[model samples]
Target: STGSATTTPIDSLDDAYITPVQIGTPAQTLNLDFDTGSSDLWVFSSETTASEVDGQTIYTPSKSTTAKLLSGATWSISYGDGSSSSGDVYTDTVSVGGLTVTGQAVESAKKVSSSFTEDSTIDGLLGLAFSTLNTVSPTQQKTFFDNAKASLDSPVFTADLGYHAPGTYNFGFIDTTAYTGSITYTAVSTKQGFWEWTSTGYAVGSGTFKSTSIDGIADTGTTLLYLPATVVSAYWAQVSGAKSSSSVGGYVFPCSATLPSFTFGVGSARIVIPGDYIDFGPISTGSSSCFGGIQSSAGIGINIFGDVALKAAFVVFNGATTPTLGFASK
Candidate 1:
């Protein structure tokens, strides 16, 4: 069977998108960030440090008779930005859209970083990457998709993120009408835990598409598009007031600067990201310079085709034993 859920951006800048998740017997609902770059489903819980909760929702496993502790198990996860969470584990009936999976691992967070606590809009993250990335100890746990896929018509999920608006995620079957034109299929390298793929080429605005294969991950968890220095530097050069700011530590330009579009190719399709999306937003309140959505990945070492790129196209996360990725315009 197939399932569907609507996702909404948490902020005006599209910092993250979140969808509702139901768990346990009576179905406690939580808005979780659906992260394709990680593989552990964790949430703020009754056990979380008291001062860390802020306005975020906390999952109370004890309230559900269906919730059972995964004895002797523990989990911890730290992201690239250093935000982290650690917890013990529980298994319960997990539901997304109308689909349900029994005995799904639910990591209950006992500790969370400031970043997680401050974001009241999201209670936790529902990781959709490969289960190999799961951080549970003693015995690793499968992701929600991994456990639910066997019962699905097909093992796959689609992310249609939006800019300053709401989008949707579909499980098991593709919604043909959600995308424009035809879908483009490409190879996904599962060598690691990411939905990592290679782009056929790219173009800065209406410029010719370069014949280059740039490897990157389709990560809904990250905010901006990060590429090599050569590409980012070249793209920013097109804007008249663009400069690498020492104050903000990345490229920023006048808020009113006219920006150019960015295009990247997958198979034969060229997906274009609007310049307005790249403007990101002002570095600070009333600041004239705005942060760029495109940044250099030199220090990070991996190019991240994050929300800034994902929202410009429809993305498919194929869940085959040997997986692949599909891209299409929206």
Candidate 2:
């Protein structure tokens, strides 16, 4: 059931925006980020203030035709940077891309970090990743996935990011026709929601560095490709006269040079990042020199392959029934 087409504006805070969705029979909606990084669904309530709702879209549960709040259930989530938020639990109908799933568990945060409070645009998050990391428990609550299981075909939910634009992320039933070829499925770690994995190797142009691999995470919620220290160093080494510039918050290099092509081997897929992404002049950080959009994670134990890398491929998420992840490209 394809619903009305609506434009979602995402700026900065990655492509995922915390906003409201109509939920319930007639429908209920809550503001959410639809985060692939985490496997939980939550919303903000009237109890939360306008200030805390900055940089987010807020959904009014009261406006929903169907809505129920759990009297005692609680929920909380923490980001990689240690930013956290928490709230009460509730259940409602959630509609997306024309499909409505009932009795979806949702969390409403009463306390959150200044990142959410100061932005005035973020209202809540809808974690669309997997179930292991879902904050919901049998004794307390279930996530949206728990309810959507019966609603999706093939028990899978697919996210077609960049299908709309640079940061546009869209979700629906898996349409294999969208893929140019057979999509590859990579077995992810069993960590709840973190979805950890190790990259087999990385290469830029003909430069293949298999001697070293790095632990990386794929997140539709982020925008930039975060590379490991070794990968970043080796990549910078290839560019003639590559220099460090904190002003751009990353390495700076000549914008005119013939930029090298980069690729990463995650499981069986050789994901590529285009040279245009590497050549950026007058960077966002105000550096005069072209800045490498690819930055280092500095041995942070994880790398975030954001939309920059994802755009080159067709990615899918099967969260409606059993959990499955798929990827392919034209």
Candidate 3:
């Protein structure tokens, strides 16, 4: 009824979190990014071109007797960043943590963007966004979470992402010992198929809370925290010598500079991001300039509370008929 899995940061920069997944009869194991911002459980597979396959593991459907091709089915998804993947579909036994789903839609990638092929750490992405966002043609397929929900003790999954260490994703139950204080639950709007919610306000460091409301998606796949341009400017202003540079990308500052923490409101709850998390990492190896984890969301059109923000708390994705999101200080 309940399942739990460990997820680790792919690199020191915590660019993304990867969790092991099992698919097919023999269960070819592959490390996948559990992305909440998108929908499509696609994988680098035997179907991919030889040159396109780098150091990543590939899922071979032919090796599994349970694998069955979804006749005429195809999928294509393009991330706003110009990265994308497209493939035909397959139905197979898939498992995550200890939970298993029979005949799960497993998209086998035939083509992946250069960014994906160049990245050796991630093999594919397992989407946690609403099934409505699925890119499959003809009949839309259910997401892994959606298929697993009906059988879970509670139709919910919680994410606990660590700074540099391993975190956890628990299905069916919220571990009481995994968080501090209490959780704050809010209504979620699945419009656009993201876990979108409105934030109460924000404060830079220990400053006064600006009572302005901000709507954004809680994206686990993205590496940084993006807010309004004005808010990003406000946070950068507090840092001495911090500025946005085209060469460096976003805002960068001296490595030794003392950074202020960021805080956001959820209902009546306040979740604070430690200053260290906002420092992000150095722009280059041995470089004194470090990029900020918080940046302007102007380019993306919508504010995104990505890993930088999610790492500050325990996040609950409750899959009720009317979905809701729960946040707890941890």
lDDT of 1 by residue, 1-330 (tens): 888999999888889998999988898999999999999999999999999999888889989989999999999999999899998999999899999999999999999999898888999999998989999998999999999989999888999988789999999999999999898989999888899999988899898889788999999999999999999998998999899977788999989988999999897889999999897888999988899999999889899999999999998888888888899998
For candidate 2, write residues 228-248 as lDDT tens digits: 776778788888888777765
Candidate 1 local distance difference test against the native: 0.92
Looking at candidate 1, the ten consecutive residues that score lowest on lDDT are 240-249
Candidate 3 ranges beyond 4 A from true positions: none
TM-score to true structure, per model = 0.99, 0.80, 0.99
Cα lDDT computed for each candidate against the true fold: 0.92, 0.63, 0.94
In model 1, what are the clashing residue pairs, if there are any? Answer: none
Query: How far off is model 3, as Cα RMSD?
Result: 0.8
The root-mean-square deviation over C-alpha atoms between each candidate and the true structure, in angstroms, is 0.8, 3.8, 0.8
What does candidate 2 score in Cα RMSD to the true structure?
3.8
lDDT of 3 by residue, 61-153 (tens): 999999999999999999967999999999999999989999999999999999999988899999999999999999899999999988999
